[PDB]
Design a protein around this ligand. Structure first.
Ligand SMILES: *[C@@H]1O[C@H](CO)[C@@H](O)[C@H](O)[C@H]1NC(C)=O
Ligand SMILES: *[C@@H]1O[C@H](CO)[C@@H](O)[C@H](O)[C@H]1NC(C)=O
Ligand SMILES: *[C@@H]1O[C@H](CO)[C@@H](O)[C@H](O)[C@H]1NC(C)=O
Ligand SMILES: *[C@@H]1O[C@H](CO)[C@@H](O)[C@H](O)[C@H]1NC(C)=O
Ligand SMILES: *[C@@H]1O[C@H](CO)[C@@H](O)[C@H](O)[C@H]1NC(C)=O
Ligand SMILES: *[C@@H]1O[C@H](CO)[C@@H](O)[C@H](O)[C@H]1NC(C)=O
Ligand SMILES: *[C@@H]1O[C@H](CO)[C@@H](O)[C@H](O)[C@H]1NC(C)=O
Ligand SMILES: *[C@@H]1O[C@H](CO)[C@@H](O)[C@H](O)[C@H]1NC(C)=O
Lengths: 320, 165, 24, 49, 98, 49, 49, 49
């Protein structure tokens, strides 16, 4: 009623001839709003145990300092996470269009991510299927190498090479985010789509839809109660269907977000809390492990993979 | 104002109107300022205090106590008062004891009916506090096990309907 | 009639409505 | 209000949205520019000839 | 009302109540999509959790999947997931190689 | 008809036809989502099979 | 425009009073069309070689 | 044509109207052929490019 008519009591008591139409629109938007606070629990709140981060950020030569939280900052965000968050109303409010806050704030989401990182490093995949079990990081990698068909002695003989390649690969992540035109386009598009969807909603109040005027009060008096009223039906129908369209588009868009949230939750389980054997599911190459990071309205995964090189041609035979 | 009809609160304006301009508009082409035809002063027009109202309540099977949340407004425009992000919350007593979220309000705040009993507000917990040791010479190996069974429920179909137009 | 180029001149304020930081 | 909104005498545990609130002004402020160019009927009715 | 006008108000009722039906159908089309996605997941889990043993974390329950059993339900399916969970760990000293 | 009358009749056709197009877009958009879902499955199978 | 008003010059000047419905319609359909050319490369373009 | 007007390209048709039929229509109930008032020639009406 604030959107369609405003402070005009003679209009608000006319909208009653429809009655249930406003209820349906209210219900649809409420359902979406509730859903959005579930999508973030399915993805991040996968642990009932919130683990403290390790005091050290350099295990086995592998240094995770760029991944783990940095307590020197008031936001306690990792160097990568702190970048993601920097790369991504009265006119609306006064017309009855408001925005609601999330149940879980960024500060709370960060704690879930920290718990997952702490478990991944100190325990491995075991905490995702029972109690956390401490293991040396070099041994955790040995298991992950066997899992891709590479004998574990390869890791130990080349531990320094592997740690060095890892450190380099992680260091280059920020350079791929801070200097790429659309690194986070997937998150920005969500923001831009809802922002313009709402702005194109309020601008329709300037339309006449066949009425002599867009202004409700100016033609409620400058005409007869029988005649002028005929144009109140016209302005209401116009404004009511404009709002109906907004709600319908949000229901469709919400379904797309749900699908994405379901995928993110699946990858949290299969990539981060384990080791995947599914091709190209957790990045290209042979999956070793993954690390979660928080982002505005979404999640970012860092996928660590093994890629073979320097193929030499040998002569073979089926049997001896 | 000289033919410009409307309603709301008239306040001091800092809009730099040109010498020939009589009124202004917002981004939705709706009047949000007028010039007073006698004093030539600019009046800033906003809606009178408003905002959505939600009622926080336990089931009527238990009690008839309620708390009221005013969205988009703080606790000075509203005329057990707690100020949160969602808006001014009145009737709920805020406590520093955290619990699992019961009736969600927003921005980490939830409400519940507890002890004699009344509605309270608190910051919701995330989970149990714990830690996993990192070491380079020690491994934990399970010496026992348990077999457990869990239940998962999924929808497959819904009611089929038809209409004779 | 030495016809010349009007370039980008001849624009005027179409109304008496105050607007700022906006495209119309 | 919640009971009427939900069309029931039973209200389940949770948070419900009902309606909005407003000041509801009753005053009417009408402003016009001063009538300066009074029409000179003086020369019509108060003429000496 | 006289015919020339009576049909106008009737036409208004027709378009109004017709739009209502339209809203119903549209919402059912969206709701149907949600059910289908669930049905597709249920079918996938039947194939991977019941007719085999999964290696996907938290797909067929939390723990190490052993087996599952289906049960029927109104408008849906219920799975009982039987999982192995380790317990009572003890601290040992280890080494990369001997 | 004259202008004051023709506009009344013409506005009925405009309103109706706008709804026809809106219905097309809404349903076409729902169908696109269905195809997108099957495309994601096809891509997954290309990768895994 | 061709769907609504067609060759009627008079009618085409009334659509402007109903708001930017054609813009929203063209915008929605364009988005769908773009996705259709995405589905195909995600499925088939699994190789850079 | 006899008060029926619009914009388009007129060409010769191969349609044969019955003696009592002045014009024909398409599936959208729009005229797409007319009989010439003077020469009794049947013309096809196709919209301009
Ligand atoms: C780990 O990497 C950071 C750069 O992100 C570096 O400043 C730090 O010194 C490294 N740690 C060690 C032990 O070298
Ligand atoms: C292996 O042999 C193929 C020809 O069968 C040749 O094209 C390729 O370059 C050779 N690779 C190496 C490493 O010699
Ligand atoms: C209502 O409260 C009674 C206890 O007085 C309890 O036995 C009953 O189950 C409750 N019903 C509901 C719907 O909570
Ligand atoms: C309440 O909001 C008003 C308007 O922004 C502001 O001036 C006032 O200081 C605020 N008071 C409190 C306690 O936040
Ligand atoms: C919670 O603790 C703070 C001090 O950190 C204190 O100022 C506040 O009054 C306490 N609130 C309650 C409800 O006890
Ligand atoms: C393992 O736990 C069971 C209880 O479920 C107990 O009966 C059994 O003796 C335990 N075995 C060992 C080696 O502790
Ligand atoms: C007459 O109108 C002018 C504005 O043009 C204003 O400045 C002046 O004060 C007015 N005179 C009176 C007596 O109000
Ligand atoms: C293993 O050692 C850690 C300390 O590194 C300790 O917290 C944990 O309780 C010990 N577990 C067992 C079973 O002794």
């Amino acid at each position: 009623t604030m959107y369609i008519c405003g402070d005009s009591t003679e209009c608000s008591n006319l909208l009653l001839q429809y009655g249930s139409f406003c209820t349906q629109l209210k219900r649809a938007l409420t359902g979406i709003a509730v859903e959005q606070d579930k999508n973030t629990q399915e993805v991040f709140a996968q642990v009932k145990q919130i683990y403290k981060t390790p005091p050290i950020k350099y295990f086995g030569g592998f240094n995770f300092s760029q991944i783990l939280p940095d307590p020197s900052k008031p936001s306690k965000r990792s160097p990568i996470e702190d970048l993601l968050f920097n790369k991504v109303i009265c006119a609306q409010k006064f017309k009855g269009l408001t925005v609601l806050p999330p149940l879980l704030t960024d500060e709370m989401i960060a704690q879930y991510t920290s718990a997952l990182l702490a478990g991944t490093i100190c325990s491995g995949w075991t905490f995702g299927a029972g109690p956390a079990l401490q293991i040396p990081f070099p041994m955790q990698m040995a298991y992950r190498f066997n899992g891709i068909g590479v004998t574990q002695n390869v890791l130990y003989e080349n531990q320094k090479l592997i740690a060095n390649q890892f450190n380099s690969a992680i260091g280059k992540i920020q350079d791929s985010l801070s200097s790429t035109p659309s690194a986070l386009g997937k998150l920005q598009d969500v923001v831009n789509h809802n922002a313009q969807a709402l702005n194109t909603l309020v601008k329709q109040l300037s339309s006449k839809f066949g009425a002599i005027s867009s202004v409700l009060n100016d033609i409620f008096s400058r005409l007869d109660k029988p005649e002028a009223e005929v144009q109140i039906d016209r302005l209401i129908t116009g404004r009511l269907q404009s709002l109906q369209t907004y709600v319908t588009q949000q229901l469709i868009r919400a379904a797309e977000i749900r699908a994405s949230a379901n995928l993110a939750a699946t990858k949290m389980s299969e990539c981060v809390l384990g080791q995947s054997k599914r091709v190209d599911f957790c990045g290209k190459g042979y999956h070793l492990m993954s690390f979660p990071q928080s982002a505005p309205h979404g999640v970012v995964f860092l996928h660590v993979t093994y890629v073979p090189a320097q193929e030499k041609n040998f002569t073979t035979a089926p049997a001896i | 104002f000289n033919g410009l009809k409307g309603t709301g609160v008239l306040t001091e304006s800092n809009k730099k109107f040109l010498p020939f301009q009589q009124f202004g508009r917002d981004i939705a082409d709706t009047t949000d300022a007028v010039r007073d035809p006698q004093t030539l002063e600019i009046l800033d027009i906003t809606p009178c205090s408003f905002g959505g109202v939600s009622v926080i309540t336990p089931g009527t099977n238990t009690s008839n106590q309620v708390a009221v949340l005013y969205q988009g407004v703080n606790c000075t425009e509203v005329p057990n008062v707690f100020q949160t992000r969602a808006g001014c919350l009145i009737g709920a007593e805020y406590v520093n004891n955290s619990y699992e979220c019961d009736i969600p309000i927003g921005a980490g705040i939830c409400a519940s009916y507890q002890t004699s009993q009344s509605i309270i507000a608190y910051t919701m917990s995330l989970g149990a506090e714990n830690s996993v040791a990192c070491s380079n010479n020690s491994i934990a190996i399970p010496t026992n096990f348990t077999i457990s069974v869990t239940t998962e429920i999924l929808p497959v179909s819904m009611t089929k309907t038809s209409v004779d137009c | 009639p030495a016809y010349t180029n009007s370039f980008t001149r001849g624009v005027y304020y179409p109304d008496k409505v105050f607007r700022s930081s906006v495209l119309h | 209000e919640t009971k009427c909104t939900l069309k029931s005498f039973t209200v389940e545990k949770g948070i419900y949205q009902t309606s909005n609130f407003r000041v509801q002004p009753t005053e009417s402020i009408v402003r016009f520019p001063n009538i300066t160019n009074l029409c000179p009927f003086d020369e019509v009715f108060n003429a000496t000839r």
